[PDB]
Coordinates of C-alpha atoms (C1' of nucleotides) in Angstrom, one line a residue:
Chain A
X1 CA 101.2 62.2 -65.2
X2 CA 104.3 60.3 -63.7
X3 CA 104.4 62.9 -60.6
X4 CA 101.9 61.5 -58.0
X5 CA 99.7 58.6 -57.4
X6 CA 96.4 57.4 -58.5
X7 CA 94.4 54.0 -59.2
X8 CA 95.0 53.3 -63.0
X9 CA 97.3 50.4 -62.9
X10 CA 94.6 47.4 -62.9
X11 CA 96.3 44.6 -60.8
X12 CA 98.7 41.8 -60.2
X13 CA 96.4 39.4 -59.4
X14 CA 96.3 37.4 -56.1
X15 CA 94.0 34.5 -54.6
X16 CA 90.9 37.1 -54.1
X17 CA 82.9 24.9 -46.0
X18 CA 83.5 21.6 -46.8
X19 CA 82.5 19.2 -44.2
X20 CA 79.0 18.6 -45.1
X21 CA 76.3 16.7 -42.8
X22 CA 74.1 14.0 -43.1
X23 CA 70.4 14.3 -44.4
X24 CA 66.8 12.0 -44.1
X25 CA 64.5 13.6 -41.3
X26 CA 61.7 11.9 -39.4
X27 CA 58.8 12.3 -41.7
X28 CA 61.0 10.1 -44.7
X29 CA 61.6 7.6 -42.4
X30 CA 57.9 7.1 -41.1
X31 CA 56.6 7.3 -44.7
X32 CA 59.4 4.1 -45.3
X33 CA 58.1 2.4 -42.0
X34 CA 54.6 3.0 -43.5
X35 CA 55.7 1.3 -46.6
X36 CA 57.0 -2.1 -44.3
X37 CA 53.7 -2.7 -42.9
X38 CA 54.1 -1.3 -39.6
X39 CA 50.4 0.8 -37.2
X40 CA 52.5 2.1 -34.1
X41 CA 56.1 2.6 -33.7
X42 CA 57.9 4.2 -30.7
X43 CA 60.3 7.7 -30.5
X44 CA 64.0 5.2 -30.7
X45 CA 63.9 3.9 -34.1
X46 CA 64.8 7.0 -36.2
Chain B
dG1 C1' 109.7 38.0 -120.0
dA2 C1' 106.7 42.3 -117.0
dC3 C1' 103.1 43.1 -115.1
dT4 C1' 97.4 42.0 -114.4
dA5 C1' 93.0 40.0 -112.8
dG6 C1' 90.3 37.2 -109.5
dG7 C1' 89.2 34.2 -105.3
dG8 C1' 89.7 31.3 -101.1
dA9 C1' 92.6 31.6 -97.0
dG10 C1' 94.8 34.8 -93.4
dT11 C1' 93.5 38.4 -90.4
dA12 C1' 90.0 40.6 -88.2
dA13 C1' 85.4 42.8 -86.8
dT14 C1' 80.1 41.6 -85.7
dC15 C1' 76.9 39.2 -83.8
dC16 C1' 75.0 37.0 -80.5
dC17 C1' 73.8 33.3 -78.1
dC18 C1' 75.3 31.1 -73.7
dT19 C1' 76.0 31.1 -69.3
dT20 C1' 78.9 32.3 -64.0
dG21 C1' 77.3 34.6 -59.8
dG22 C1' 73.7 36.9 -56.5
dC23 C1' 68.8 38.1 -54.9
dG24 C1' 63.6 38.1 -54.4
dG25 C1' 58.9 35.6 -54.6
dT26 C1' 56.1 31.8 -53.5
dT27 C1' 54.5 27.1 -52.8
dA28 C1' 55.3 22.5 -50.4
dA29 C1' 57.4 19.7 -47.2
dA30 C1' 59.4 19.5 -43.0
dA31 C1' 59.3 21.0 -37.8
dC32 C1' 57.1 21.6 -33.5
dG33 C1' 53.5 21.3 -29.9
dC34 C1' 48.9 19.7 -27.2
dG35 C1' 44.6 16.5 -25.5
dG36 C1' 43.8 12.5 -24.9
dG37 C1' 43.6 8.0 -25.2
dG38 C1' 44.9 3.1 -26.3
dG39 C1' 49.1 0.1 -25.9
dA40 C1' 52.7 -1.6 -22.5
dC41 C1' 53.4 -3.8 -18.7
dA42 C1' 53.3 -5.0 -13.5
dG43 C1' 50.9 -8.4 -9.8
dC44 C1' 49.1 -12.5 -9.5
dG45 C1' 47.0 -17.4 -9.7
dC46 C1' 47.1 -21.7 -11.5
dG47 C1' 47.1 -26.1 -13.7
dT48 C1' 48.9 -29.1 -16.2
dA49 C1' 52.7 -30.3 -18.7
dC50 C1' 56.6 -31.2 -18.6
dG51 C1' 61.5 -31.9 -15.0
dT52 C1' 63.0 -35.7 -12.7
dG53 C1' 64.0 -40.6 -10.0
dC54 C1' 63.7 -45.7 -11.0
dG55 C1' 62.1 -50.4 -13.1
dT56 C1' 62.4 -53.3 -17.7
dT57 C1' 63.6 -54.3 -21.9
dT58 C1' 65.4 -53.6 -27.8
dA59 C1' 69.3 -52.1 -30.1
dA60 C1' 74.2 -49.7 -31.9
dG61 C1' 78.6 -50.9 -31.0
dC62 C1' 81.0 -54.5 -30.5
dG63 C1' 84.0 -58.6 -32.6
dG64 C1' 84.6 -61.1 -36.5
dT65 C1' 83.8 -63.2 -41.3
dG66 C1' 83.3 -64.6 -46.4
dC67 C1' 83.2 -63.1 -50.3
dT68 C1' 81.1 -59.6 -54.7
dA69 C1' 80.0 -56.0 -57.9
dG70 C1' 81.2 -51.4 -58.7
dA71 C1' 85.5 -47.9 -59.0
dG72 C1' 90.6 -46.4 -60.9
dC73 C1' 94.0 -46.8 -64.3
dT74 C1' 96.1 -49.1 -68.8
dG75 C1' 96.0 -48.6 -74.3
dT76 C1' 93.7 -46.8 -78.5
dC77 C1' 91.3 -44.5 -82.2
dT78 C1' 88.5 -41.3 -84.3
dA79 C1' 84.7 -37.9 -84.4
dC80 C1' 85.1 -33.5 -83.7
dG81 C1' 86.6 -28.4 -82.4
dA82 C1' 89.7 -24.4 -82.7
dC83 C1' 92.8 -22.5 -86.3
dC84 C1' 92.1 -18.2 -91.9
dA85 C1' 87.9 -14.6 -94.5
dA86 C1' 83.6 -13.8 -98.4
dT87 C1' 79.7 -13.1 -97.2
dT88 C1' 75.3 -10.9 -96.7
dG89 C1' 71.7 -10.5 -94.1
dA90 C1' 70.1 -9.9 -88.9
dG91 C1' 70.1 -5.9 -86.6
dC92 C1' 71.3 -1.9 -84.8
dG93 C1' 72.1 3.9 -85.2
dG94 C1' 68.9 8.0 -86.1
dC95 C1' 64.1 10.1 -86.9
dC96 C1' 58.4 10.7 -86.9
dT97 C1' 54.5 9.9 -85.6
dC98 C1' 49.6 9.4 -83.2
dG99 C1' 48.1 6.3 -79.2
dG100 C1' 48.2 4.7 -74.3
dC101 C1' 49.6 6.8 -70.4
dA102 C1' 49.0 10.9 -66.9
dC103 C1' 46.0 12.5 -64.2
dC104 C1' 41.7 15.0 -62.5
dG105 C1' 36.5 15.6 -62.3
dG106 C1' 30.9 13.8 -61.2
dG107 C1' 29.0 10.3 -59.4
dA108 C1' 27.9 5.9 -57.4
dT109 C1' 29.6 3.2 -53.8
dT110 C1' 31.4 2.2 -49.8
dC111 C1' 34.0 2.5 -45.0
dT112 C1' 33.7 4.5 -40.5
dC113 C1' 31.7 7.4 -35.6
dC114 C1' 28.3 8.8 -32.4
dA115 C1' 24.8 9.5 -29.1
dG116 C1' 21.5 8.3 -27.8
dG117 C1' 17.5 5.0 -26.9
dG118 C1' 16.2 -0.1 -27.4

DNA sequence: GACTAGGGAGTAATCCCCTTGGCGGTTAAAACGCGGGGGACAGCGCGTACGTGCGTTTAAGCGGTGCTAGAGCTGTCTACGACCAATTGAGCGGCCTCGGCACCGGGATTCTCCAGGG
């Protein structure tokens, strides 16, 4: 029993992103520019 | 006075409902790409409507005046508003409906495109 070595001690017990990005897309946008009144709008305004 | 009996708290075991993570399935929204066409814009011409020079006058600033009715401060009082609480009802905190809202279908109605002739 106290001669050798074997796994049957448990543990101590140790430790064991954040930056994030922004969201919207193109399609939310044109349905908002839809909303304002607007037929054709160019590729810049996103 | 010595020991006895019973029940809610102290200790403890049961249940068991409640969630932490990951992972797969599947629909919807987002992502990407092409033909073609309508919107953007150059080149230009012009005319006519202002941009500008000069004559000929009314008018704001000028220079001053003689006051005149409305504006600031001096008392002064007195009608009224910010100081306790009993109240007691105007109204809010929690629950239980059935009805208007949610939303989709059949149809009438209506809005739009084309390839031709008319």
């Amino acid at each position: 029993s106290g001669r050798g070595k074997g796994g049957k001690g448990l543990g101590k017990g140790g430790a064991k992103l954040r930056d994030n990005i922004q969201g919207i897309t193109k399609p939310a946008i044109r349905r908002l520019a839809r909303r304002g009144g607007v037929k054709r709008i160019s590729g810049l305004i996103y």
